[PDB]
From a paper:
We solved three distinct structures of PIN8 using single-particle cryo-EM after reconstitution of the purified protein into peptidisc: an apo form at 2.9 Å resolution, PIN8 with IAA bound at 3.2 Å, and PIN8 with NPA bound at 3.4 Å resolution. The apo form of PIN8 displays a symmetric dimer of PIN8 characterized by a twofold rotation axis perpendicular to the membrane plane with a distinct concavity extending into the membrane along this axis from the non-cytosolic side. The scaffold domain comprises helices M1, M2, M6 and M7 and creates a large interface (1,512 Å2) to the other monomer in the dimeric complex. This interface is mediated mainly by M2 and M7, and is further stabilized by a lipid in a groove between M1 and the kinked M6. We also observe another lipid with an aliphatic tail sticking into a pocket of the transporter domain. Next to the crossover, there is a well-defined water-filled binding pocket nestled between the scaffold domain and the transporter domain that is open to the non-cytosolic side of the protein via the concavity. By contrast, access to the cytosol is blocked, clearly defining the conformation of the apo-PIN8 dimer as an empty outward-open state. The higher-resolution apo-PIN8 map reveals two peaks in the site, which are modelled as water. The highest-resolution map of the apo form was used for initial model building, but all maps display excellent density for the entire protein except for 39 residues of the disordered cytosolic loop, which were not modelled.
Numbering used by the authors:
A (entry chain B), B (entry chain A): 0 to 164, 206 to 367
The structure:
Amino acid sequence: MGISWLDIYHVVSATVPLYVSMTLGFLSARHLKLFSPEQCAGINKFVAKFSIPLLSFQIISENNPFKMSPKLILSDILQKFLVVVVLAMVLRFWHPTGGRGGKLGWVITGLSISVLPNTLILGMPILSAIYGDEAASILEQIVVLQSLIWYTILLFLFELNAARAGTMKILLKAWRKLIINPNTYATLIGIIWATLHFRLGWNLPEMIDKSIHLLSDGGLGMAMFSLGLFMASQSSIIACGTKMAIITMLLKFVLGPALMIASAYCIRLKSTLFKVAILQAALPQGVVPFVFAKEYNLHPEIISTGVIFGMLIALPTTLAYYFLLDL
Amino acid sequence: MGISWLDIYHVVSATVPLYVSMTLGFLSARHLKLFSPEQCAGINKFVAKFSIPLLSFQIISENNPFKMSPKLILSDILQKFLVVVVLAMVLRFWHPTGGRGGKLGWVITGLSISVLPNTLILGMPILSAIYGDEAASILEQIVVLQSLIWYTILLFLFELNAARAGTMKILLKAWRKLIINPNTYATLIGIIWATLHFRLGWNLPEMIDKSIHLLSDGGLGMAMFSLGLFMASQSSIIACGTKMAIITMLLKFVLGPALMIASAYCIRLKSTLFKVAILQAALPQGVVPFVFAKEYNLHPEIISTGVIFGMLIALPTTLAYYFLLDL
Ligand SMILES: CCCCC/C=C\C/C=C/CCCCCCCC(=O)O[C@H](COC(=O)CCCCCCC/C=C\C/C=C/CCCCC)COP(=O)([O-])OCC[N+](C)(C)C
Ligand SMILES: CCCCC/C=C\C/C=C/CCCCCCCC(=O)O[C@H](COC(=O)CCCCCCC/C=C\C/C=C/CCCCC)COP(=O)([O-])OCC[N+](C)(C)C
Ligand SMILES: CCCCC/C=C\C/C=C\CCCCCCCC(=O)OC[C@H](COP(=O)([O-])OCC[N+](C)(C)C)OC(=O)CCCCCCC/C=C\C/C=C\CCCCC
Ligand SMILES: CCCCC/C=C\C/C=C\CCCCCCCC(=O)OC[C@H](COP(=O)([O-])OCC[N+](C)(C)C)OC(=O)CCCCCCC/C=C\C/C=C\CCCCC
């Protein structure tokens, strides 16, 4: 009914291609030694500047902004705000790596981990099967919200952190670096388009659609490839260590879903919407935050280890959360 | 009937996405300066090692080897043999760029130009519209033949040229470098699969299909992006000069189709098969030979310029050949 041995195969089939691309990249960088560190950085930069922005535009444009659930958006925003508050407060007392400082980069890493899960590739096969078609729409809205708001805010935070190493000048520099990002323009053009298309009926010219799909089609595969390329340069598969890996897992699969449950209860969600909203926050970490961290070199090892170890822990964790919510 | 103003739009729509990726890459390398030469080389290496081989596997596997036209295969082989003979004989008297040696590299460039046109992306919209469904199958068989035989032989020739700078040792070195290429294994596994699938009914597991499509979907777009990246490093758009550009155009749009006509007459093709066979040889140059030339650094400027200026000359040239063949 809710779970069978055929939907588990669907989850495994959704997860395996990503790991295959990851392993291909890792072998290429380490064993085959096809790519040098500069070439790996170039591949990651191409993914960050052309693949992710075009994926974001494709996701946002094909979503009706006027059919989005206001309560889902409020729940997502409240979850992000609660996670930010918790990360800011905890860092005030307990600081990773001995209390050196840099509490803004740690908040960026914590937001990349906790509140930006992989919602489409791995979140569809399990949640849609367990619940149905409502889960599909909810997850699509969540992914649209990610690409539209949360990636842009994450990039702004990355640029603000980079600018920090009198305050208004730093914010101005971060903003100036943002308004040249392909991602902010992707989100703006995508939302403007979506509005025109779903309110005026305009259809994207076939030439432009094909042009976008030509370069954006392999975005996810290249993101996993870049993750493997980065892993090839690390001493061990757990690049961040055992303690930091445990902390990453706790943030992703306990803090994330717990604060999402708090957000859903505060917003007073009900039924399938509530259940899918609090179950999607337990989905694995996702690779776009890793791409941004690698581009800005902000603890990419932690994000990569979380991504690698979350794709395996998602299914048991999603099943555990489903069973917990059932009774 | 044969040609209208709606099929011209189809040709333009097929051509434009490639030029859009080309221009994006060119701007990135030259104006935005996102990629350094090492990073551009890394992107091209990824395209050559993962995109083109997986595209070749997809093309070969999805083609029934037992339904291929023997006469079409014979005509293609005879074209290639005649073109090789002509290139070898002409180089014996007239040498490009004054007078020097290196006649094997010039033959490789001449084969990349004359006898490896872009058959699917730009060859479908015009030939299928003018003729119908027979053109589709003929062009698919031609593309399968390319990916299966001609890319492998071109790579072997590239490796043989590289090894040259006593003869049996050079051939052994070229063979050893070949049997580690992803392309030879792609073709071999693709043909073995195609055989099993179309003779025993085996279906490729969905996981493997998704894994291949994850890394191969953005293959052509990245190839055009790499072409733009290379163009960004050249002094002028006509990287090979005016005389060499003219020679490239003559080889692609006169020698290629002319020797295809000779081959078809020798093999005694008839009707739509004959016409499509001799009209597909006039299609533009295609980017995979450029990717290989850039990887081996064998006159990449000439192949690049031919690709630049053939996508614009193909439609008038294809129309001219169609009118010539009509009467
Ligand atoms: C438009 C809606 C709002 C969206 C937000 C975007 C833009 C507007 C906001 C701009 C301000 C950004 C924060 C600057 C604060 C500087 C403080 C300082 O002064 O130092 C900061 C301290 O930071 C903090 O503790 C936390 C700051 C805020 C964290 C992030 C805020 C997130 C914003 C909105 C919620 C949504 C989040 C999700 C986004 C990602 C997607 C999941 C860093 O330096 P430090 O003092 O720790 O150095 C060490 C010095 N010693 C050793 C002496 C102590
Ligand atoms: C399995 C079926 C057959 C497929 C072919 C593959 C493998 C088997 C063949 C192996 C031999 C390869 C050629 C080595 C010859 C060395 C000659 C020499 O000694 O020098 C060669 C000379 O070359 C030539 O003139 C032409 C050689 C042959 C050209 C290519 C042959 C193509 C093969 C098959 C037909 C299909 C082609 C299409 C493939 C691409 C897809 C469109 C180079 O040096 P050079 O002397 O000019 O130097 C200069 C010295 N000075 C200045 C003193 C003169
Ligand atoms: C509305 C009109 C049609 C669409 C054109 C408009 C915007 C496209 C978005 C971004 C590129 C153009 C605007 C970017 C700001 C200008 C600066 C720039 O040139 O910034 C390139 C960007 C950052 O690089 P930088 O740090 O070197 O900047 C510094 C460059 N300098 C060294 C020269 C100073 O780098 C990059 O790769 C830029 C991204 C290149 C790949 C394209 C991604 C586009 C994403 C989504 C939209 C896609 C399709 C359109 C949908 C249909 C609409 C009807
Ligand atoms: C039959 C069993 C399943 C398929 C596995 C078999 C073959 C796959 C093809 C190629 C990779 C493995 C064999 C390659 C030869 C071994 C050498 C190697 O490791 O060579 C990697 C190749 C060249 O690199 P190198 O010059 O550094 O070699 C020197 C490396 N050392 C420095 C260590 C000496 O580089 C590369 O990227 C290699 C290519 C990596 C990307 C994969 C492309 C595969 C293409 C088509 C087949 C795809 C899917 C399977 C279809 C379904 C089948 C049922």
